[PDB]
């Protein structure tokens, strides 16, 4: 009884072989990927709060969040 | 009884072989990846709070968060 | 009874072989990766709080956090 | 010039107050949460490999992983 | 100038107060949480390899891993 | 100039007060939490390798790991 498994990359006359090899030359920058699984929760995810009150502000409110 | 497993990369006449080898030449900067699993929770994730009150502010409120 | 396992990278006439070898030449700076598993919790993760009250601020509030 | 900040929980005639206090009476067991940020990598995450060859096995292969 | 900050929990006639106090009565056992940030890497994370060859095994292979 | 800061828990007629106090009565046993940050690395994390060759095994291989 005989079994053969072969995985082959074969080149004559001089060129590159890339075998099971991830190559990343480009710049990689995914931004703001939110994966959320929530039950019964109060979640602020990727949800920054910016408030500015400035230059002669009276009797005034910024209300943010939950 | 016979078995052969072969994994081969073969080049005649002089060039690169990259075999099972991760190559990263590019710049890597993923930003703000939030993965959240929340049950019954009060979560602020990746959610900075900035408040400025400045230059003649009276009787005034910034309300942020939870 | 016979077994042969071969994993082979072969080049004639002189060039690079990279075998099972991580190569990182690029700059690496992933930023703000938040992984959160929360049950029944009050979690501030990657959620800094900055408050400035400055230059004639009276009877005023920045409320942030929990 | 006056400011008053109040957070109040008030009870007449005898009952529990739970204030900013996480309470977990249930059993907590999240299983197999994989968070993966990958660039140019060979990653096996949460990916066990089980191989059994048993009881009269001849000239045979189990091939797993990357 | 006057400022008052109050955080109050008040009960008449005898009962529990839980204030800024985490309470965990349940059994806590999260399992197999993998958080992975990978660049240009060969990572086996939470990925055990089990191989059994047993009871009359001839000319045979379990190949696992990388 | 006047400032008052109060944090108060008050009960009339005798019962428990838990103030800024972690209470853990449950059994705590998180298992197999892997946090991995990898650049240019060959990492086996929480990835044990078990190989058994037993009871009439001939010309046979378990290959695991790297």
Curated annotation (Swiss-Prot), chains A, B, C, D, E, F:
Biased region (Polar residues) positions are: 26-41
Report the outcome of residue 29 to E: No association with plasma membrane
Q: List the subcellular locations.
A: Cytoplasm, Cytosol; Cell membrane; Cytoplasm, Cytoskeleton; Cell projection, Axon
Q: Where is this site: Not glycated?
A: 8, 10, 20, 63
Sites bearing Phosphotyrosine, chain numbering? 19
Q: Which residues are glycosylated?
A: 25
Residue positions of the PTM N6-acetyllysine? Answer: 10
Its tissue distribution reads: Expressed in neurons. Isoform PNS-tau is expressed in the peripheral nervous system while the others are expressed in the central nervous system.
Cross-link Glycyl lysine isopeptide (Lys-Gly) (interchain with G-Cter in ubiquitin) lies at: 10
Region annotation (Disordered) ranges:
23-42
Modified positions (Phosphothreonine) in chain numbering:
28, 52
This protein's domain notes: The tau/MAP repeat binds to tubulin. Type I isoforms contain 3 repeats while type II isoforms contain 4 repeats.
Q: Which disease is it linked to?
A: In Alzheimer disease, the neuronal cytoskeleton in the brain is progressively disrupted and replaced by tangles of paired helical filaments (PHF) and straight filaments, mainly composed of hyperphosphorylated forms of TAU (PHF-TAU or AD P-TAU). O-GlcNAcylation is greatly reduced in Alzheimer disease brain cerebral cortex leading to an increase in TAU/MAPT phosphorylations. Frontotemporal dementia 1: A form of dementia characterized by pathologic finding of frontotemporal lobar degeneration, presenile dementia with behavioral changes, deterioration of cognitive capacities and loss of memory. In some cases, parkinsonian symptoms are prominent. Neuropathological changes include frontotemporal atrophy often associated with atrophy of the basal ganglia, substantia nigra, amygdala. In most cases, protein tau deposits are found in glial cells and/or neurons.
Subunit details:
Interacts with MARK1, MARK2, MARK3 and MARK4. Interacts with PSMC2 through SQSTM1. Interacts with SQSTM1 when polyubiquitinated. Interacts with FKBP4. Binds to CSNK1D. Interacts with SGK1. Interacts with PIN1. Interacts with LRRK2. Interacts with LRP1, leading to endocytosis; this interaction is reduced in the presence of LRPAP1/RAP.
Entry protein name: Microtubule-associated protein tau
Question: What is this protein's gene name?
Answer: MAPT
């Amino acid at each position: 009884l005989t079994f053969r498994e072969n995985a082959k990359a074969k080149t004559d006359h001089g060129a590159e072989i890339v075998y099971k090899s991830p190559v990343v030359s480009g710049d990689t920058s995914p931004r703001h990927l939110s994966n959320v699984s929530s039950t019964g929760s109060i979640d602020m995810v990727d949800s920054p709060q910016l408030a500015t009150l400035a230059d002669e502000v009276s009797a005034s409110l910024a209300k943010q969040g939950l």
